[PDB]
Write a protein that binds this ligand. Structure first.
Ligand SMILES: Nc1ncnc2c1ncn2[C@@H]1O[C@H](COP(=O)(O)OP(=O)(O)OP(O)(O)=S)[C@@H](O)[C@H]1O
Ligand SMILES: [Mg+2]
Lengths: 194, 150
């Protein structure tokens, strides 16, 4: 009964000041994006999410319109100032196929094998973290192939063989792919609306 | 043109947005990289007064080296600056003035120093003959040209 009362109090707190208003404090415009991300996180927090497959976003758009800002504020909403629950990964560092060792460590018999992986360690520290793969398009696509296991089922086996469950994580992927096309189509639609 | 017309009687934002912005976008291929830059600072070429100031800076540098290392008070007229400005290349910039000073002035100084035609404390006036020529001074009416052999 105490757990149900605490859950109802948390639900009333979220209904009083949801993620949409908390994002509208920081983010300006992007009402479609705030609505999409808020509806998805509302589906997650109210228990209406498939617990097997993690929630995965791709933020597309022009430069400096709140992709990384909305991802950061989404992480701050889910975990407050806890740095464990916001696994930032600047994917412009991952421009070559062999940069997956940062994710999954190194195999046995190689340098850096004892340290293991970086993302797998950070997700061991916080399985339900908001992992921000910032600028995902700037990485090699073969490096993004590692994210298949991590997006379909939330698993990422390190160099030492230790798999980590990451199903509750909220993966966010900022990218400027088709930024010119999205910007031109939005400007065209605004001209037609005017 | 406007100055002489009035006597007879700054890079603009549009240039940055219409000319330089497409060139930067073409080279760097990413507006996200350019939008992170706070100040795209524009360095313009040198005006003629700035070329004279560059020649004076280079000649003062060699004068300070001559005074410190060897105690040779180097001197020069404004005509020396006007002569050495003619070796300025717009494409190369201030490096052209440094190379021109090293060609015309300092090769002669080095050849004079190797030949021991520049004792300590002596004054030395670079003078336009236009070929520059060194002139050692001892009194208020003695200026013999240094005969630098090959
Ligand atoms: N819609 C917005 N409302 C308020 N501040 C914003 C907004 N969009 C961007 N900013 C500010 O912009 C700065 C960084 O913007 P980002 O969050 O990098 O946006 P972005 O769309 O990731 O684009 P990039 O360059 O292609 S990675 C931060 O200080 C934010 O405060
Ligand atoms: Mg960003």
């Amino acid at each position: 009964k105490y757990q149900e009362k605490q859950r109802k109090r948390e639900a009333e707190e979220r209904r009083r000041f949801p993620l949409e208003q908390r994002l509208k404090e920081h983010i300006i415009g992007q009402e479609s994006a705030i609505a999409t991300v808020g509806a998805a996180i509302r589906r997650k927090e109210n228990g209406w999410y498939d617990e097997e497959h993690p929630l995965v976003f791709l933020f597309l758009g022009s430069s400096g319109i709140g992709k990384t800002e909305l991802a950061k504020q989404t992480a701050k909403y889910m975990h407050k100032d806890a740095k464990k629950g916001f696994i930032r990964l600047d994917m412009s560092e991952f421009q070559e196929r062999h940069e997956v060792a940062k994710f999954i460590g190194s195999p046995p018999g190689y340098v850096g094998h004892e340290e293991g992986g970086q993302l797998t360690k950070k997700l061991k520290q916080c399985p339900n973290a908001v992992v921000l793969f910032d600028q995902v398009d700037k990485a090699h696509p073969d490096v993004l192939t590692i994210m298949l296991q991590l997006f379909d089922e939330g698993r990422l086996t390190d160099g030492k063989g230790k798999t980590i469950d990451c199903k509750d994580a909220i993966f966010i992927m900022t990218s400027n792919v088709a930024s010119d096309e999205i910007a031109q189509h939005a400007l065209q639609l605004r001209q037609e609306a005017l | 043109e406007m100055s002489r017309n009035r006597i007879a009687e700054t890079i603009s934002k549009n240039f940055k947005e219409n000319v330089i912005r497409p060139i930067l976008k073409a080279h760097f291929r990413r507006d996200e990289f350019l939008g992170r830059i706070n100040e795209i600072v524009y360095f313009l070429p040198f005006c003629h007064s700035e070329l004279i100031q560059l020649v004076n800076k280079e000649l003062n540098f060699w004068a300070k080296r001559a005074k410190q290392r060897h105690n040779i008070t180097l001197l020069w007229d404004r005509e020396v600056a006007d002569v050495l400005v003619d070796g300025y290349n717009v494409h190369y910039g201030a490096r052209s003035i440094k190379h021109e000073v090293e060609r015309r002035v300092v090769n002669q100084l080095a050849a004079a120093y190797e030949q021991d035609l520049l004792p300590g404390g002596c004054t030395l006036r670079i003078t336009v003959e236009p070929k520059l020529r060194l002139e050692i001074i001892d009194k208020d009416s003695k200026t013999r040209r240094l005969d630098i052999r090959a």
